[PDB]
Amino acid sequence: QQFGRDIADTTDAVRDPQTLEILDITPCSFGGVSVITPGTNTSNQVAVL
Amino acid sequence: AYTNSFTRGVYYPDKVFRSSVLHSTQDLFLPFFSNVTWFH
Amino acid sequence: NQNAQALNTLVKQLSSNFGAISSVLNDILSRLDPPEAEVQIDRLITGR
Amino acid sequence: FNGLTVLPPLLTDEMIAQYTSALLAGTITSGWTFGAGPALQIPFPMQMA
């Protein structure tokens, strides 16, 4: 083996060249940006989720 | 002389690592319970 | 079961070609020029 | 995953269990009256009567 595959066509692990070492690949974190506001009738302060 | 293979003739399809999954592939394989030829 | 199975189908349709030379975006980007690669991207765009 | 996120529910399982516990304590201690107006106490043999 050289690289492991997911159920999609993306990688999941890889054999590192120049050292023959095995490394796990997970994607770094993401998410939507949700903004909590009381409305502009009261205040312009917001909280970001 | 003829005999039957039970579950043999399986190998790795695509030189790739998979874990805790079930993968379906289309590749040249030995069929299960087929007549294989025995020579002494 | 239906929601996880529809999610697994939505994940598994990423590996489909839809007529492309490869299904992953970075490989068909990284060895092609953009003015010949735009329709090559766009088939995967309309399929996904 | 790649682009897929699962939002948690607003009501957690403890709060759904506390709604069902409030409904069960209401129906045991008052019959039918807590869904109409105030919860009015009654013995459970007279409720079942």
Alpha helices in D1-49 (DSSP H): 13-30, 44-48
Cα torsion B29, B34, B39, B40: sign? positive
Please report where in the chains the tokens 């201690």 appear, as a residue: D29
Q: Report the residue numbers after which chain C has a gap, meaning the C atom sits over 2.5 angstroms from the next written residue's N, or none.
A: none
Q: Which residues of A touch C18 (CB under 8 A)?
A: none
Q: How many CB pairs under 8 A join A and B?
A: 15
> Which amino acid makes up residue C18?
F
Quick check: B21 contacting A, CB < 8 Å? yes
Distance from the B5 Cα atom to the nearest Cα atom in chain A, whole angstroms: 28
Q: What are phi and psi of D3, to 5 degrees?
A: 100, -15
- Partner A contacted by D13 (CB < 8 A): no
Contact criterion met (CB < 8 Å) for B16 and A13 = no
What is the Cα–Cα distance from A5 to D35, expressed in whole angstroms? 56
Q: What was the structure determination method? A: cryo-EM
Return the residue of C nearest to D3 by Cα.
Answer: C11
Q: How does DSSP assign C8-22, residue by residue?
A: HHHHHGGG--TT-S-
In Å, how far are C3, C8, C15, C40 from A7, measured between CA atoms?
17, 9, 8, 23
Identify the three-state secondary structure at position D20.
helix
**How far is the alpha carbon of C24 from chain D, nearest alpha carbon, in Å?**
13
- Structural Rg of chain C based on CA atoms: 13
Helix (H/G/I), strand (E/B), else coil: A4: strand
Instruction: List residues in chain A touching D: CB distance below 8 A.
Output: 8, 10, 27, 30-32
CA-based nearest distance C25→chain D, Å: 13
Residues 6+ apart with CB under 8 A from B17: A1, A3, A4, A5, A13
Nearest CA-CA partner of C45 in C22, C30, C21, C25? C25
- Give the CA-trace dihedral at A38, A41, A45, A49, to 10 degrees: 30
**Are D5 and A32 inside 8 Å of each other by CB?**
yes
Q: How far apart are CA B27 and CA B15, in angstroms?
A: 13
- In the 8-state DSSP scheme, what is residue B35? E
Resolution (Å units): 3.7
What is the four-CA torsion angle of A18, A23, A27, A29, rounded to 10 degrees?
-110
